[PDB]
């Protein structure tokens, strides 16, 4: 799972940025 825990860690990174972003959606 050398991949898929590489990616793990960047999916939060990412989910992270995707959460900031909505989170100021109203």
């Given at each position: 799972?050398?991949?898929?825990?590489?990616?793990?860690?960047?999916?939060?990174?990412?989910?992270?940025?995707?959460?900031?972003?909505?989170?100021?959606k109203?």
């Open positions: 799972m050398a991949q898929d825990i590489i990616s793990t860690i960047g999916d939060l990174v990412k989910w992270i940025i995707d959460t900031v972003n909505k989170f100021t109203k």
